[PDB]
Protein: Malonyl CoA-acyl carrier protein transacylase
Organism: Acinetobacter baumannii
Amino acid sequence: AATKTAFVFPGQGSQKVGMLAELAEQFSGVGQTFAEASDALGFDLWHIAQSGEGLDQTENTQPVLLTASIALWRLWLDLGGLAPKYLAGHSLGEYSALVAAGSMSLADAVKLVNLRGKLMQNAVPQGEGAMAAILGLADDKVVELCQSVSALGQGSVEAANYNSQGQVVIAGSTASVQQVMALAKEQSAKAIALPVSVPSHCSLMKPAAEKFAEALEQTAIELPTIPVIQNVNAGIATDVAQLRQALTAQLYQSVQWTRTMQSLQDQGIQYIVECGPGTVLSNLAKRLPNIEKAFSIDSKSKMEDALNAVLVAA
């Protein structure tokens, strides 16, 4: 039981062709985790991860990433890692956290996030939605820009991820996203388009969220054995009813990641381990004033180094 360490689980965009391949050669538990998830789904998730064929289509990205995350979680615990005090995951990663915490089985969740991906892909016609990063402005300013552009009638655009102070991802109708990017730049901020087509975490997702809720409502969920800070409110549910309600609202509302990292620090968390491929959540966590260090456990060397450092600090 690690008192000063939390685990964070990444989402869409952290996948990469060839991920975990070195760690799978050395540890057979990785390939076993992938075979178990692939059996649930009926297609080979390791092949997608290693060939890239279909890797970037989110109905595949989401179960591939959740499986990769749980493979590394299982290896960490197998190699003697301590159990973190809190869990949190970014969008898809919230489901990875719930599996890690025993709230859902690997098989149920890999099916659920395959469905989540299918529904997200179909939420708006291709090309009609977009996401972009706005850099250098406060949260309230990005909200105001989005509200004003949305009032022009040309479409809808909303703050979709609060990722760090000064880093807000927006989402909505393609032209409205482009308009906010232009106004952000005119007001001396920076803005870049992201390589997705699905406008996640905005109101354009509400119909897809309604469809997904029907499936979610009939899925078995238990309260996690490690508390999970959830995206919609940066909060920890008291009921299973609250946990489900926060999951049901997650897809069409902003990801409160800045507040999640603030909440972790306000609980004495000082080390963060990114349990998944890549370093996205790590880089969002180094620059935080109370986070001593953040680790990814992506490789043989990263895993043992993070195993060591956390064991020392704890």
User: Anything to note?
Assistant: The chain has 13 helices and ten strands. The domain at 124-197 is CATH 3.30.70.250 (Alpha-Beta Plaits).
